[PDB]
Amino acid sequence: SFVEMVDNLRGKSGQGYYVEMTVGSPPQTLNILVDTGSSNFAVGAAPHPFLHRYYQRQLSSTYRDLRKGVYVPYTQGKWEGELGTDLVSIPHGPNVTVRANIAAITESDKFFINGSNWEGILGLAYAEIARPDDSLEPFFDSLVKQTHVPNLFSLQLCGASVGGSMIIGGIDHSLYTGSLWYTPIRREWYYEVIIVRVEINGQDLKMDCKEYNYDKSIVDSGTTNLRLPKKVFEAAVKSIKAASSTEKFPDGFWLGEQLVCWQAGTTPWNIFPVISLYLMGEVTNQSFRITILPQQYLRPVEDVATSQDDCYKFAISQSSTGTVMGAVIMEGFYVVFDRARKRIGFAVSACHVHDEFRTAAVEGPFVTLDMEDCGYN
Ligand SMILES: CC(C)(C)c1cccc(CN[C@H]2C[S@@](=O)C[C@@H](Cc3cc(F)c(N)c(OC(C(F)(F)F)C(F)(F)F)c3)[C@@H]2O)c1
Q: Where, by residue number, is the active site?
């Protein structure tokens, strides 16, 4: 029954992927950002310059006030509001209705994005990181508890104005090619995984693998970039600089500030290396790798001048909260959040990114000793 959910995601580049939902009785329609990096379901519930519509609790006969406040600080942006519950549906999702916790957003700072076309956020990670605390049941937990929808979902985020699929309750085999490879969810709070090796253009970075997961590695559809811990970021940039030294770049480009352009159609893709992340596998001493093409970490942005060149921003950036595998890693992969079996699956997406002589890949098996030592404590 998954064909009804194919292509149920939309978005604008760098502004996230959202799915249509309805809340309340009668149903109020809102676009909701899908975010595996948080665990709160929250919606605009009051006028805001960037909102063209919002949730109106007074108009819903099924609304219940929980008479308790709440706020959530993200990396950038935050909101506060009122907790309550209401009936929620996903039109292009499973044919069910659930009563879910909803944070009605009454105030916010840099949360909503001008022109993003979404009015709320769907936190799909675990109760452990819910605000105010882990007793506030996340939406997907409610869905699974109240219905017969199996305890997993999958995301196919496609690049170029963007679209994708959130298959709720299963895996749609027409969305990927090749085999699915699975890495354990290390702990159910964020979708935390363990990176055991990193290579750039086939060359091992040769760092202590704990550095890759310091202080954690997570899969986060609410983040645009691949984000890397300071030491790893510097090693990666040094290596990517070396490989592309043929050309000169503004150092503000490597900081993700200045975009670089080339004459439309002449982007020197070949001088930018592929990046391979090796993830812990399902059996002893076994891992697998996902390989990212430059077409994924050089994100296309519109011309800041009058010309019609191809311009790009460097979409790898430094993190102080661990590795974040954001949308640009997830794009061109089919990612399965298999909560029931505590694992995340990766396969080459059907909407995979193209290079002339190179291809994004998910490959295994590999042997990797002492993978347990890669986890940071
Ligand atoms: C407390 C809590 C929630 C567990 C937490 C605190 C810090 C870091 C994290 C890890 N996950 C975070 C990383 S943060 O960069 C984005 C956040 C979700 C989010 C909040 C926002 F305000 C906005 N605008 C947003 O839109 C982005 C973008 F436009 F790129 F900003 C777009 F559009 F790309 F999606 C996305 C996600 O959840 C969780």
A: 35, 220
